[PDB]
From Swiss-Prot, chain B:
Domain EF-hand: 9-39, 74-109, 110-145
GO molecular function, one term: calcium ion binding
InterPro entries with a match to the protein in the record: EF-hand-dom_pair (IPR011992), EF_Hand_1_Ca_BS (IPR018247), EF_hand_dom (IPR002048), Myosin_RLC (IPR050403)
Classification via PROSITE patterns: EF_HAND_1, EF_HAND_2
Organism of derivation: Gallus gallus
Organism ancestry: Eukaryota, Metazoa, Chordata, Craniata, Vertebrata
Modifications after synthesis and translation: The N-terminus is blocked. N,N,N-trimethylalanine, found in other myosin light chains would not have been detected in the N-terminal tryptic peptide in PubMed:7358336 because it would remain trimethylated and ninhydrin negative after hydrolysis.
Superkingdom, natural source: Eukaryota
GO cellular component, one term: cytoplasm
Miscellaneous comment as given in the Swiss-Prot or TrEMBL entry: This chain binds calcium.
Keyword Calcium in record: yes
Designated name of the protein: Myosin regulatory light chain 11
Subunit organization: Myosin is a hexamer of 2 heavy chains and 4 light chains.
Gene Ontology biological-process entries: muscle contraction; skeletal muscle tissue development
Function noted in UniProt: Myosin regulatory subunit that plays an essential to maintain muscle integrity during early development. Plays a role in muscle contraction.
Swiss-Prot record, chain C:
Quaternary structure, from the entry: Muscle myosin is a hexameric protein that consists of 2 heavy chain subunits (MHC), 2 alkali light chain subunits (MLC) and 2 regulatory light chain subunits (MLC-2).
Localization per record: Cytoplasm, Myofibril
Domain note: The rodlike tail sequence is highly repetitive, showing cycles of a 28-residue repeat pattern composed of 4 heptapeptides, characteristic for alpha-helical coiled coils. Limited proteolysis of myosin heavy chain produces 1 light meromyosin (LMM) and 1 heavy meromyosin (HMM). HMM can be further cleaved into 2 globular subfragments (S1) and 1 rod-shaped subfragment (S2).
Residue stretches making up the Myosin N-terminal SH3-like domain: 30-79
Family, per entry: Belongs to the TRAFAC class myosin-kinesin ATPase superfamily. Myosin family.
Function of the protein: Muscle contraction. Myosin is a protein that binds to F-actin and has ATPase activity that is activated by F-actin.
Residue numbers of N6-methyllysine PTMs: K32
Full protein name: Myosin heavy chain, skeletal muscle, adult
Annotated residues for binding of ATP: G176, E177, S178, G179, A180, G181, K182, T183
Residues modified to N6,N6,N6-trimethyllysine: K127
Species the sequence originates in: Gallus gallus (Chicken)
From Swiss-Prot, chain D:
Name assigned to this protein: Myosin light chain 1, skeletal muscle isoform
Any Gene Ontology CC annotation: myosin II complex
GO biological process: regulation of myosin II filament assembly
PTM statement from Swiss-Prot or TrEMBL: The N-terminus is blocked. N,N,N-trimethylalanine, found in other myosin light chains would not have been detected in the N-terminal tryptic peptide in PubMed:6709041 and PubMed:7238855 because it would remain trimethylated and ninhydrin negative after hydrolysis.
Domain EF-hand: 3-38, 41-76, 80-115, 115-147
Portion of the full sequence shown: 46 to 192 of 192
Keyword Repeat: yes
Keyword terms, alphabetized: Methylation, Motor protein, Muscle protein, Myosin, Repeat
Subunit structure: Myosin is a hexamer of 2 heavy chains and 4 light chains.
Organism the protein comes from: Gallus gallus (Chicken)
Amino acid sequence: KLLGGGDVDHTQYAFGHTKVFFKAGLLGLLEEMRDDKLAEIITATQARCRGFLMRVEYRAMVERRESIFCIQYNVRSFMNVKHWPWMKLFFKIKPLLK
Amino acid sequence: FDETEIEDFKEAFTVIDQNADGIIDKDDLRETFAAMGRLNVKNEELDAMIKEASGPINFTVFLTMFGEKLKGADPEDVIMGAFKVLDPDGKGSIKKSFLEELLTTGGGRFTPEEIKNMWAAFPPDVAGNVDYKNICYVITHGEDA
Amino acid sequence: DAEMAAFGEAAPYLRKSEKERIEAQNKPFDAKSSVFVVHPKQSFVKGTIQSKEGGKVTVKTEGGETLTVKEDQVFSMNPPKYDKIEDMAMMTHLHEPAVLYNLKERYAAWMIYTYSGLFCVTVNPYKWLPVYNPKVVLAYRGKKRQEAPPHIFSISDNAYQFMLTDRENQSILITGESGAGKTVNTKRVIQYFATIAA
Amino acid sequence: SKAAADDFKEAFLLFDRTGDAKITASQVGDIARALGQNPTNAEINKILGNPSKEEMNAAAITFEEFLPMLQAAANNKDQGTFEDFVEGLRVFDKEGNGTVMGAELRHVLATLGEKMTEEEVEELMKGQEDSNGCINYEAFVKHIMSV
């Protein structure tokens, strides 16, 4: 079923009861490259992780970024306002509303 | 400025502008204060409110004056968003010393002296960082509830 | 590793640890330069291609020697993926040297059974091995030769299998020179039959 | 090239804790990753040593060395193919569904090859593995390539 895919010569091989048969030295070349690519691999799967790992660190020396501000400014308002006639008014009044 | 907050300022502008012409003059300020119970509202208080504007208080002059004083104003749902990220397990009000350390050590706006002023009218729980939610209420609408 | 238990003690002489393998197949290789070559004293030794005389070849050796030999005195070398291949006939390099060399390597590692197609090559240990081990006998019992490493009981069991599966008679042809040690095998095969179906 | 991306210089001012516009050689690995480059730690190590640069003794940096080292690492981004990442984990567990048992991926990511701390391994599984003990790596590798 696997060999179903690939832009490969569906000739060059042949199957049988315990194994596939394959011609040479190209496919041979392919594999080799492949071979190196796995030495990397885990290695390759590590990297992204590592990468990615720090990529979240930046967002943190980072996520928080705004939630603070929000908190920051938000308080300041109040400190200013709470002493304002109009705002006290709204306050006593805010309840009668619906 | 979200649009419902601008509609709340339009409703407050209509309750203070009792002549309904679109410009709050000093007579509107005095008659709104007298209808709230202020029989002794001095003319110097009305003149200090008008001295914060460069022109007549129409709806866009009232919005720009409130914008320039509320440049860090945050709605209650975004303050509770940030406090749910500070208490990510939900329900519990966060510790007093955790909010003092995280305000200081992250930002200059969270410096201590300011943290003593935060505890000072925002009471204990609020100040301490244990309760939560009452501080979001009084940051969007001041004074004791 | 996980699999091997049945043998356990024999294992090392049948198969290699899953990293010994790994450490061998996954290693640096330079095809275009690495090669096998003719050799006046030693039959075929390995080397690295240095230059190219247009139809002559100069090669370094593994021991340190330099020879300029014909183009066809030079033979490719299998990628490391084929280190101590159970079935040399799976190699992508069907040479004379590569065959000699495969046998040789898995012997220096004490593996006496290596397949070469249908054959079951067997090399005289000249010493004792836990292979004829009464644990092995079972292990090889009911296993196609692809489910287990190169060994004579493989042949011998499969025969049996095949015997009952296909309803055909079987044969085993043992052959070698005077000192190859066939009787030994023959006998050993025989015990096998007697045991597994008495 | 500039496309002169001057935001790499602005990010160097966010990683230099002294404000003198130099970044130590031990930070260069993690800052290449934060600029959108994933060189393996052995590669970052080799290059360094390759240039007779010792990461064992005190180091400083200048922007004039960090810029060309990021540009030498930027050619190696053609090694980041997601077909091989999902097929690696598809060969790591049986059956036709992409699930690693929790502790298999945690012990392999900490002890196989470039050692990732178990603190970082728990921070990379947090949310994608639920209480069944089965990590769906189709969505797990999707979210790892979202950063």
